[PDB]
Design an enzyme around this catalytic site. Sequence first.
Site, PDB file in Angstrom:
ATOM      1  CB  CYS A 122     -37.017  80.660  17.052  1.00  0.00           C
ATOM      2  SG  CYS A 122     -36.583  80.316  15.338  1.00  0.00           S
ATOM      3  CG  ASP A 123     -38.305  81.384  23.177  1.00  0.00           C
ATOM      4  OD1 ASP A 123     -39.499  81.756  23.141  1.00  0.00           O
ATOM      5  OD2 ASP A 123     -37.784  80.863  24.187  1.00  0.00           O
ATOM      6  CB  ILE A 124     -37.929  87.536  20.342  1.00  0.00           C
ATOM      7  CG1 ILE A 124     -36.908  87.445  19.201  1.00  0.00           C
ATOM      8  CG2 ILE A 124     -37.915  88.936  20.960  1.00  0.00           C
ATOM      9  CD1 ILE A 124     -37.183  88.384  18.028  1.00  0.00           C
ATOM     10  CE  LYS A 128     -34.978  81.193  25.580  1.00  0.00           C
ATOM     11  NZ  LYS A 128     -35.311  80.180  24.549  1.00  0.00           N
TER      12      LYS A 128
END
EC number: 2.7.11.1
Length: 276
Positions: A122-124, A128
Amino acid sequence: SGMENFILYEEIGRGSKTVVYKGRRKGTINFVAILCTDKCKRPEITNWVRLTREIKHKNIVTFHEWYETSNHLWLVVELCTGGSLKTVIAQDENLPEDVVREFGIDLISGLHHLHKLGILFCDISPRKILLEGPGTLKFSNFCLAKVEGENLEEFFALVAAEEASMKSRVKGSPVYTAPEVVRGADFSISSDLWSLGCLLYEMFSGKPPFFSESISELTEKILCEDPLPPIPKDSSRPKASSDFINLLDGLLQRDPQKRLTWTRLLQHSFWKKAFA
Ligand SMILES: c1ccc2c(Nc3cc(C4CCC4)[nH]n3)nc(Nc3ccc4nc[nH]c4c3)nc2c1
């Protein structure tokens, strides 16, 4: 017991209400990363643990333990001494295509393992993703990940209740958000593949395909702008291969029904049969 069992060394990173230390399990030579955070972060930490605690994969940071003291939560996970992919990109300014392919195979392996399990990242984003060193990229922050179809605001609220506001806390970076999600759709395997396209584009070119400091401009770029081809900041460096451009064109289709599928992604010529 608990944090009594660890030696804490230097701080290696920080975040909001968070500090990460290098650590070692007493009586062993096993080094770890120890994230120390405020107890108000219980929803984010609980989500990270529940999604990853049984995952054992080279391209996903390993979970070891989590603990609670009087005023802090503690997450003990795999140590990655190579820093974030964001730092790698900022240093080199741009990565050769062979390096992008090697890193991309890591990203594919990890994301394929997650999606097989029904887990959306969801937050590639470069911040991260951590490096083992010299390479070996690993997905390394699951605060905002979820299982397909889940309402993560609802999950956060339930964790907080035991001990609408959650609609904000579940917001990652808007830069890599797929158009259908910008327009109100829920995250999906396909929207993660869009974000992968943005990441590969940024690794080669040094900048994301769609960016504005202003939110409204960024929204319009994602929905209207065509970004190909990626060009390094160092204009003298080699241009993208036709295979790499073709791969990005498939991943950055705005229509998710037209976007490259996993099956075609793994077979793409860019990987040089890495997944044959
Ligand atoms: C140089 C070298 C290594 C690091 C590093 N290594 C890590 C971090 C971890 C786990 C702690 C949860 C992932 N394993 N390995 N981390 C950081 N910064 C950071 C800071 C707040 C973070 N919250 C989640 N992840 C964060 C990451 N910088 C570094 C700079």
